[PDB]
Amino acid sequence: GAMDHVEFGLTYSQLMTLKDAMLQLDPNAKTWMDIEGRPEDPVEIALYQPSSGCYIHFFREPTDLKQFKQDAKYSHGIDVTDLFATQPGLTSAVIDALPRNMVITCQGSDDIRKLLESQGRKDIKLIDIALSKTDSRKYENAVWDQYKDLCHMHTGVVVEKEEITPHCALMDCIMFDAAVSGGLNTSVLRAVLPRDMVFRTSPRVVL
RNA sequence: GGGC
RNA sequence: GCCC
Ligand SMILES: [Mn+2]
Ligand SMILES: [Zn+2]
C-alpha cells in the first residue's frame, strides 16, 4: 500500500547468506533460466549452469489464485497447497543478486524478459534458443527419468484432450540444455540455495 | 508457431 | 482456458 515502505523481503542475514551461496554461480558460464507461472506472478523459478551442475530452484505463492489453478491445468500442474511454506522475497533477492550484464539462455524469452525488467534488470542479456516444442522436449523423458527426485511439486494432471507430462522450471532448463548439446549426461546436480532458505522448515506444540 |  |  501507499503507506508501506519495505525494501527487502529477506533479512540482511539471509541476504548475506544468499550472496555467498550465489558465488557458486560462474558469471561467465552458460546459464539457463526458466519459470512457471506468469512473469507478473511467478510460482517456480530455476537457473541452471550445466558446466558445474549447479542449479537455483525455488517457489513463490501466487497472488492471482484463479489464474494459477487455470495455468496448472494446461502447464505446470503445481499443487498450490505445496507452495505454502515458501520464502517471500526470494524472487526479488535472487534476481537482484545476479551478476551485472549476465548472459542468460532460455526457450521463449518474452516471459523471462518481463520478469527481469520488472525487477529492474534490463542489463541482463537473453539468448532465446527458439526451438519447436518437439525439438525442445526431445530429452524430456530422459531428464525426468534421471532427475525426478529434484522436484515433487507437479502432481496435478496436465492436458493439451490428451494428458501430457507437467512443465517444471528445473526439468525444463536441464532438457533444453540437453537439446542444444545433442545429448544428456548422467551426472549428479548440486543445489545452490540452502533448503531452509527455500522452504519454511523448523514447533513442539501448537500455540 | 510460442509461452503459462 | 489465458498470454506473446
Ligand atoms: Mn519457459
Ligand atoms: Zn518443478
Residue numbers in the entry: 356 to 515, 522 to 563, 565 to 569
Show sentences the authors wrote.
Lassa virus (LASV) nucleoprotein (NP) is the only known 3′-5′ exoribonuclease that can suppress type I interferon (IFN) production possibly by degrading immune-stimulatory RNAs. We therefore propose a novel immune evasion mechanism in which NP suppresses the IFN induction by selectively degrading these immune-stimulatory RNAs.
We obtained crystals of NP-C in the presence of an 8-bp dsRNA oligo (5′-GGGCGCCC-3′/3′-CCCGCGGG-5′) with either 5′-OH or 5′-triphosphate (5′-ppp), with the 5′-ppp dsRNA complex diffracted to a much higher resolution (1.68 Å). These crystals belong to a space group of P41212 with unit cell dimensions of a = 46.74 Å, b = 46.74 Å, c = 217.31 Å, and α = β = γ = 90°. Single asymmetric unit cells contain one NP-C monomer bound to an RNA substrate. The electrostatic surface potential map shows that the dsRNA-binding surface, with a surface area of 606 Å2, is highly positively charged. Electron density of the RNA substrate clearly showed the presence of 4 bp (5′-GGGC-3′/3′-CCCG-5′) in the catalytic cavity. For convenience, the 8-bp RNA is numbered as 5′-G1G2G3C4G5C6C7C8–3′. This was because a catalytically active NP-C domain was used in the co-crystallization process and was predicted to have removed the last 4 nucleotides from the 3′ end of the cleaving strand, resulting in an intermediate dsRNA product with a 5′ protruding end of the complementary strand (5′-GGGC-3′/3′-CCCGCGGG-5′). The 4 nucleotides 5′-GGGC-3′ of the cleaving strand were almost completely buried in the catalytic cavity. In particular, the 3′-end ribonucleotide C at position 4 of the cleaving strand was coordinately anchored by several residues: Arg-492 through a water molecule forming a hydrogen bridge with the phosphate group, and Arg-426 and Glu-391 through their side chains forming a hydrogen bond with the 2′- and 3′-oxygen of the ribose of the cytosine ribonucleoside, respectively. Remarkably, the 3′-end ribonucleotide C of the cleaving strand was positioned precisely in the deep pocket of the catalytic site, with the terminal bond of the ribonucleotide completely exposed to the catalytic residues for hydrolysis.
